[PDB]
Design a protein around this nucleic acid. Structure first.
Ligand SMILES: [Mg+2]
Ligand SMILES: [Mg+2]
Ligand SMILES: [Mg+2]
Ligand SMILES: [Mg+2]
Ligand SMILES: [Mg+2]
Ligand SMILES: [Mg+2]
Ligand SMILES: [Mg+2]
Ligand SMILES: [Mg+2]
Ligand SMILES: [Mg+2]
Ligand SMILES: [Mg+2]
Ligand SMILES: [Mg+2]
Ligand SMILES: [Mg+2]
Ligand SMILES: [Mg+2]
Ligand SMILES: [Mg+2]
Ligand SMILES: [Mg+2]
Ligand SMILES: [Mg+2]
Ligand SMILES: [Mg+2]
Ligand SMILES: [Mg+2]
Ligand SMILES: [Mg+2]
Ligand SMILES: [Mg+2]
Ligand SMILES: [Mg+2]
Ligand SMILES: [Mg+2]
Ligand SMILES: [Mg+2]
Ligand SMILES: [Mg+2]
Ligand SMILES: [Mg+2]
Ligand SMILES: [Mg+2]
Ligand SMILES: [Mg+2]
Ligand SMILES: [Mg+2]
Ligand SMILES: [Mg+2]
Ligand SMILES: [Mg+2]
Ligand SMILES: [Mg+2]
Ligand SMILES: [Mg+2]
Ligand SMILES: [Mg+2]
Ligand SMILES: [Mg+2]
Ligand SMILES: [Mg+2]
Ligand SMILES: [Mg+2]
Ligand SMILES: [Mg+2]
Ligand SMILES: [Mg+2]
Ligand SMILES: [Mg+2]
Ligand SMILES: [Mg+2]
Ligand SMILES: [Mg+2]
Ligand SMILES: [Mg+2]
Ligand SMILES: [Mg+2]
Ligand SMILES: [Mg+2]
Ligand SMILES: [Mg+2]
Ligand SMILES: [Mg+2]
Ligand SMILES: [Mg+2]
Ligand SMILES: [Mg+2]
Ligand SMILES: [Mg+2]
Ligand SMILES: [Mg+2]
Ligand SMILES: [Mg+2]
Ligand SMILES: [Mg+2]
Ligand SMILES: [Mg+2]
Ligand SMILES: [Mg+2]
Ligand SMILES: [Mg+2]
Ligand SMILES: [Mg+2]
Ligand SMILES: [Mg+2]
Ligand SMILES: [Mg+2]
Ligand SMILES: [Mg+2]
Ligand SMILES: [Mg+2]
Ligand SMILES: [Mg+2]
Ligand SMILES: [Mg+2]
Ligand SMILES: [Mg+2]
Ligand SMILES: [Mg+2]
Ligand SMILES: [Mg+2]
Ligand SMILES: [Mg+2]
Ligand SMILES: [Mg+2]
Ligand SMILES: [Mg+2]
Ligand SMILES: [Mg+2]
Ligand SMILES: [Mg+2]
Ligand SMILES: [Mg+2]
Ligand SMILES: [Mg+2]
Ligand SMILES: [Mg+2]
Ligand SMILES: [Mg+2]
Ligand SMILES: [Mg+2]
Ligand SMILES: [Mg+2]
Ligand SMILES: [Mg+2]
Ligand SMILES: [Mg+2]
Ligand SMILES: [Mg+2]
Ligand SMILES: [Mg+2]
Ligand SMILES: [Mg+2]
Ligand SMILES: [Mg+2]
Ligand SMILES: [Mg+2]
Ligand SMILES: [Mg+2]
Ligand SMILES: [Mg+2]
Ligand SMILES: [Mg+2]
Ligand SMILES: [Mg+2]
Ligand SMILES: [Mg+2]
Ligand SMILES: [Mg+2]
Ligand SMILES: [Mg+2]
Ligand SMILES: [Mg+2]
Ligand SMILES: [Mg+2]
Ligand SMILES: [Mg+2]
Ligand SMILES: [Mg+2]
Ligand SMILES: [Mg+2]
Ligand SMILES: [Mg+2]
Ligand SMILES: [Mg+2]
Ligand SMILES: [Zn+2]
Lengths: 126, 50, 206, 119, 70, 50, 87
RNA sequence: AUAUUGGCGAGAGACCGAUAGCGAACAAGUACAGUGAUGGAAAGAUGAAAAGAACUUUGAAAAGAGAGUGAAAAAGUACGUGAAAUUGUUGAAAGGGAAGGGCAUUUGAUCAGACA
RNA sequence: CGUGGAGGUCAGUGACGAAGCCUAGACCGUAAGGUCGGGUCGAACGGCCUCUAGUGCAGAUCUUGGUGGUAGUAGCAAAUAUUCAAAUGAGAACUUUGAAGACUGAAGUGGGGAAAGGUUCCACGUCAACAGCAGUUGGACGUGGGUUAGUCGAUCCUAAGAGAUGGGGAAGCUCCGUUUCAAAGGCCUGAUUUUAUGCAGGCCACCAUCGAAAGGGAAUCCGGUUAAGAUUCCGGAACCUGG
RNA sequence: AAACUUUCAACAACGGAUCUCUUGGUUCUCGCAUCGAUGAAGAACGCAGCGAAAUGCGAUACGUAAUGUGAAUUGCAGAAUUCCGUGAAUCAUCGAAUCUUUGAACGCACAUUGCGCCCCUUGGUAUUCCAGGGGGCAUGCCUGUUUGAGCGUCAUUU
């Protein structure tokens, strides 16, 4: 258990910092773990989800469905997938909001920097 | 009035501005809570004291 | 302390057909007129309001503390008690439980765990775990939030990495003989822990 | 698209002052269009740019001055270090370090010896 | 708008720090036009309004749709 | 307020005493610091004694 | 006549808005504000009136300058600019 | 070495749990009162997600009736649970200047146990 | 007996439904209370041993909130008074418009201002609340528009007053004093023709300042024009002050 | 016999208890020393494509510069060039600026957007009148500078 002195196990402070946390911090909280596949591949377990990324909802009702992360909705603490949606009574369509932690990464949109992140957590890339 | 300072002309103007209703789009934001302008003022109901 | 009292309320005196607690003055605001200070008025002060200078800690006689801790120790033999008091010892070698001194030096949780198991712990560690529950009260949101039974308490003599091995396993607490804590020797004032002593430890007692 | 920071800081003194003039014209023209249209967010990024221009027209002229004054007693208070009012009148290292003659003669003579016990 | 169609007047919302002088000149300088007089007034909302009459040589209307609006 | 066969006590709580009441809640938190701040001296003050 | 008629004559300000605190507490004839104390050098405070104080002490405001002094402090009053890195 | 109901940063509690806890969990020193010094409130909770009810029909409309959404509209921006006082309809009963109560039994309604 | 919280324990109950609420259904206790059924309900909760207290309500002209009988009751009666018809609208005693009956009776219910309000003005839209019947109307609601000056006010002047200043008191916030035991300032040009303003005369001893939209005071008028502005715009005709 | 009164029940009302929640409040404890004439605290008024407020900012106005991160922002509209990049962002950090009107508040006033003086500069045919642009002028006190006063007073003239 918390054997340090600058870390708090207090439930109040915890939930504040969650909910109040700024966008730049949210990116990191909204992470998805890689696929069993992509994991042996880049030698790496998780990763801060981003936009043009590919994914499998391995939880929830939308289980099995898959797609490209349309947008990350940091504000709403939720991610949206282009392809996973609701058709209202008026037939119009609307995005469902999936949570990063219930997704799995399938193909990684790659950057100079995405690469460097992967390289920095001890990863590798093909 | 009908011969006042600018100082008052002024307050009077700011006064005027705030006397609008909640712009109905603020209501549609995420986490919005403001239902209506809770701070509104009517000339024959509350006087503003210069 | 300043609370109940951030008002200005004087009474209204007798004769205005209304009770005579002090009342908030002024006007134009609902609060205006209402009861103040009264240990029974809304937004009153409270009766005999708690203080910081309550007697919190207690002076216990230094010598009883001993006679207590001693008595506490004597019962961690006594089969029946350890049994009576929780602790699945239903079937461990002999009471007291004396393990090798090599225990004191085991440095990996995973190791220690199955050592402890071999010595007979198993059912008892399992007795915790099978028992983490949501604190019924409000310590549920005062970081007293879960709860669970007490496990075996492993007394050692020299700590050569035992404590950090057994740290993370739920229910098992560790202690060097030179201390020995009455709060752990009879948790909740109930006699007879499940103590498992390294030999070097055991021998330090006299 | 907006203007950029570094792209300006190399633009010439009155290339720079010029661009401002033309930005202010853009703005003018926009504020006309603004009222003849249900929206004109475009405006937000032209008035944002005027800032940047002015900002850099200022930065340059400042450390233009800041340097001519760099390295002499007395330079404008607004190039002077801010720190804190009290900081700004606390004794300077020197006038603090100041020991008396008699003093150092003794400091020197009998200084704190790095002794130690054991044997 | 009728001031412009009828009167040869250019109405401008103007900075409140500005006077009849500064208005006249900074119109002359910004629109290439000759001004007769500059009657001004403080709108009830905190913005100076400028009535601005050009001389007989300029048809304000033509100016109006050469600045942009109309 | 004299009654029964008790001693006569002289407890001096007639001034505004609730005001000057020093509970040493921090008895612990002073030892520590004192320890903490002794150690830093030993450390600083070289192989010298305290 | 000491009631609802004599209130008829009420229409003459004793105070206008005070320049220092903007309060409609500026005693016209007596030419001082009844809250802040302008034009006195000190602002008007009293210790028997705390809710009074609490309605004005630093923090009730903008803190235009004071906000940042703890930050500025946090890094020992940094004269200079920042350099550059990677990523 | 001492002090510290202020200030900046932290870790806590056999503390209070929205009539409590600071006056303020909310656009609270707000709104509102006073000529002024000052006084000073109330006010948290749909659901996992608005999926916040297309469409049809009666209506001038608000709405109602259908349909629809949802695990639930016995959650419909009057929104978790929804007590009491108090109220409507429905059912049963009693009532010749109060009503309620005690012991006992008739009558009506209703119900446990128990047999094997 | 019972409640909020703590130590221990039952490896206690629970989304296959915890808590809570309803229940002239059942059971245990002399009682405080305890247990079950059923209904409602949605995330928590309990037994036993100990610990702990902001620990039990019918009252206190108790506090805050909420709710009744009174009761469809009292009442909606001052200021002479209304009526026909059309138009509009779902809707007309009440709005629009035409008619008729009257009033205020120029010491006005007329036509304007000062104080005070601050957008109430005007247009369009428009009825949930408000106008103690009503509402199609409004000083309401939503939405826009509107206040133009050398001469009209402020501004300048001084009044009773107010109040800095050299000072004098006062522990001190601060009190006294206003020309006051004060070294209290600026004007005309000349001297310049290095040159911009040093000095060459003489005066001048007045020593703040604030304090009047009714006192004092330089100067404007007529016609036209707007949904709403005018001695302020348009048009023609002047007048003053400075250069 | 109704109605009406009253009692129990179901359902529906009124009300908002109770249960469960908690980005809050309270109390303890540890660490640390930083407001302002280099204009503080506080005030007023303004600033967004669509805002009244709370928050933020200051006519460079929910922000400019810088640095870190490495792609959002999100109620709608939007740029789109901003995605292997001096580069998305109501992000973090912050060392650079801008910072109206004021406030100890400082040319004088102030129930006035009131009224002067000085320097530089620009236009009007202008050392002097008017206008525009910049930079200035409070008080007490210390060190020094310069210019002066008093038969307070020393010497020196011929
Ligand atoms: Mg990571
Ligand atoms: Mg399944
Ligand atoms: Mg989510
Ligand atoms: Mg009133
Ligand atoms: Mg007290
Ligand atoms: Mg009474
Ligand atoms: Mg309280
Ligand atoms: Mg439990
Ligand atoms: Mg409970
Ligand atoms: Mg940018
Ligand atoms: Mg300096
Ligand atoms: Mg024409
Ligand atoms: Mg004592
Ligand atoms: Mg010592
Ligand atoms: Mg009154
Ligand atoms: Mg008076
Ligand atoms: Mg005074
Ligand atoms: Mg002053
Ligand atoms: Mg202390
Ligand atoms: Mg403290
Ligand atoms: Mg601690
Ligand atoms: Mg409260
Ligand atoms: Mg309580
Ligand atoms: Mg309160
Ligand atoms: Mg809250
Ligand atoms: Mg309210
Ligand atoms: Mg809820
Ligand atoms: Mg609720
Ligand atoms: Mg919700
Ligand atoms: Mg329906
Ligand atoms: Mg349900
Ligand atoms: Mg529900
Ligand atoms: Mg709805
Ligand atoms: Mg409900
Ligand atoms: Mg009976
Ligand atoms: Mg008990
Ligand atoms: Mg209890
Ligand atoms: Mg309690
Ligand atoms: Mg039973
Ligand atoms: Mg059931
Ligand atoms: Mg249940
Ligand atoms: Mg729930
Ligand atoms: Mg007990
Ligand atoms: Mg009590
Ligand atoms: Mg009782
Ligand atoms: Mg009661
Ligand atoms: Mg009672
Ligand atoms: Mg009562
Ligand atoms: Mg009542
Ligand atoms: Mg009725
Ligand atoms: Mg009647
Ligand atoms: Mg009557
Ligand atoms: Mg009449
Ligand atoms: Mg009528
Ligand atoms: Mg009529
Ligand atoms: Mg007549
Ligand atoms: Mg007459
Ligand atoms: Mg009338
Ligand atoms: Mg009139
Ligand atoms: Mg008014
Ligand atoms: Mg309007
Ligand atoms: Mg009207
Ligand atoms: Mg209606
Ligand atoms: Mg009305
Ligand atoms: Mg009515
Ligand atoms: Mg009505
Ligand atoms: Mg209106
Ligand atoms: Mg004018
Ligand atoms: Mg005149
Ligand atoms: Mg003037
Ligand atoms: Mg004086
Ligand atoms: Mg005057
Ligand atoms: Mg006059
Ligand atoms: Mg006329
Ligand atoms: Mg007009
Ligand atoms: Mg008119
Ligand atoms: Mg004319
Ligand atoms: Mg003429
Ligand atoms: Mg002349
Ligand atoms: Mg009942
Ligand atoms: Mg019901
Ligand atoms: Mg509760
Ligand atoms: Mg919850
Ligand atoms: Mg806390
Ligand atoms: Mg601590
Ligand atoms: Mg202050
Ligand atoms: Mg603001
Ligand atoms: Mg905002
Ligand atoms: Mg935006
Ligand atoms: Mg970069
Ligand atoms: Mg930021
Ligand atoms: Mg600027
Ligand atoms: Mg002044
Ligand atoms: Mg001024
Ligand atoms: Mg200037
Ligand atoms: Mg001197
Ligand atoms: Mg001299
Ligand atoms: Zn004031």
């Amino acid at each position: 258990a918390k054997q340090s002195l600058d870390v708090s196990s207090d439930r109040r402070k915890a939930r504040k910092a969650y909910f109040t946390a700024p966008s730049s911090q949210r990116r990191v909280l909204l992470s998805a773990p890689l696929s069993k596949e992509l994991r042996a591949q880049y030698g790496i377990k998780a990763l801060p989800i981003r936009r043009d990324d590919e994914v499998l909802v391995v939880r929830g009702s939308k289980k099995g469905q898959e797609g490209k992360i349309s947008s990350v909705y940091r504000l709403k603490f939720a991610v949206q997938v282009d392809k996973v949606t609701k058709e209202k009574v008026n037939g119009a369509s609307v995005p469902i909001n999936l949570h990063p932690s219930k997704l799995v990464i399938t193909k990684l949109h790659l950057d100079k920097d995405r690469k460097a992140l992967i390289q920095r957590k001890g990863g590798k890339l093909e | 009035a009908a011969q006042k300072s600018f100082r008052i002309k002024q307050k009077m103007a700011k006064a005027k501005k705030q006397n609008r209703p909640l712009p109905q789009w603020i209501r549609l934001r995420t986490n919005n809570t403001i239902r209506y302008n809770a701070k509104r003022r009517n000339w024959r109901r509350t006087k503003m004291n210069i | 302390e300043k609370a109940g009292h951030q008002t200005s309320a004087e009474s209204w005196g007798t004769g205005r057909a209304v009770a005579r607690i002090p009342r908030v003055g002024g006007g134009g605001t609902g609060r205006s007129g209402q009861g103040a200070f009264g240990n029974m008025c809304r937004g009153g002060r409270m009766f005999a309001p708690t203080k910081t200078w309550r007697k919190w800690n207690v002076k216990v006689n230094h010598n009883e503390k001993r006679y207590a801790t001693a008595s506490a120790i004597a019962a961690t033999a006594v089969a029946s008690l350890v049994l009576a008091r929780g602790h699945r010892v239903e079937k461990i070698p002999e009471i007291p439980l004396v393990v090798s001194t090599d225990l004191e030096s085991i440095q990996k949780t995973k190791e220690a765990v199955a050592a402890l198991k071999a010595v007979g712990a198993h059912s008892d560690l399992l007795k915790v775990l099978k028992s983490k529950k949501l604190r019924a009260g409000k310590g549920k949101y005062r970081n007293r939030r879960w709860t669970q039974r007490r496990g075996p308490l492993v007394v050692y003599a020299e700590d050569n990495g035992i404590v950090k091995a057994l740290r993370n396993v739920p229910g098992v607490e560790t202690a060097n003989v030179a201390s020995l804590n009455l709060l752990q020797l009879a948790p909740g004032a109930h006699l007879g822990r499940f103590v498992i002593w390294t030999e070097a430890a055991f021998t330090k007692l006299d | 698209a907006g203007v950029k920071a570094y792209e300006l800081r190399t633009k010439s003194k009155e290339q720079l002052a010029s661009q401002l003039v033309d930005l202010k014209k853009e703005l003018a023209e926009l504020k006309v269009q603004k009222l003849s249209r249900p929206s004109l967010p475009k405006i937000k990024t032209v008035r944002k740019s005027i800032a940047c221009v002015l900002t850099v027209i200022n930065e340059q002229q400042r450390e233009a001055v800041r340097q001519l004054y760099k390295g002499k007693k007395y330079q404008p208070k607004d190039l002077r270090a801010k720190k804190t009012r009290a900081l700004r009148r606390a004794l300077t290292k020197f006038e603090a370090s100041q020991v008396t003659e008699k003093q150092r003669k003794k400091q020197i003579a009998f200084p704190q010896r790095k002794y130690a016990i054991k044997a | 708008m009728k001031k412009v169609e009828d009167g040869n007047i250019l109405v401008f919302q103007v900075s409140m720090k500005a006077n009849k002088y500064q208005i006249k000149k900074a119109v002359k300088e910004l629109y290439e036009v000759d001004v007769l007089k500059v009657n001004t007034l403080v709108r009830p909302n905190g913005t100076k309004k400028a009535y601005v009459r050009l001389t007989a040589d300029y048809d304000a209307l033509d100016i109006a749709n050469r600045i942009g609006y109309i | 307020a004299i009654s029964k066969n008790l001693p006569i006590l002289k407890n001096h709580f007639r001034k505004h005493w609730q005001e000057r009441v020093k509970v040493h809640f921090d008895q612990a938190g002073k030892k520590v610091s004192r320890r903490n701040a002794r150690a830093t001296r030993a450390a600083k003050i070289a192989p010298r004694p305290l | 006549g000491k009631g609802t008629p004599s209130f008829g004559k009420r229409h003459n300000k004793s105070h206008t808005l005070c320049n220092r605190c903007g309060r409609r507490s500026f005693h016209v004839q007596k030419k001082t504000c009844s809250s802040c104390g302008y034009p006195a050098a000190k602002t008007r405070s009293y210790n028997w009136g705390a809710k009074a104080k609490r309605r004005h002490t630093t923090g009730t405001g903008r803190m235009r300058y004071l906000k940042h002094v703890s930050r500025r402090f946090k890094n020992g009053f940094q004269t200079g600019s920042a350099s550059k890195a990677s990523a």
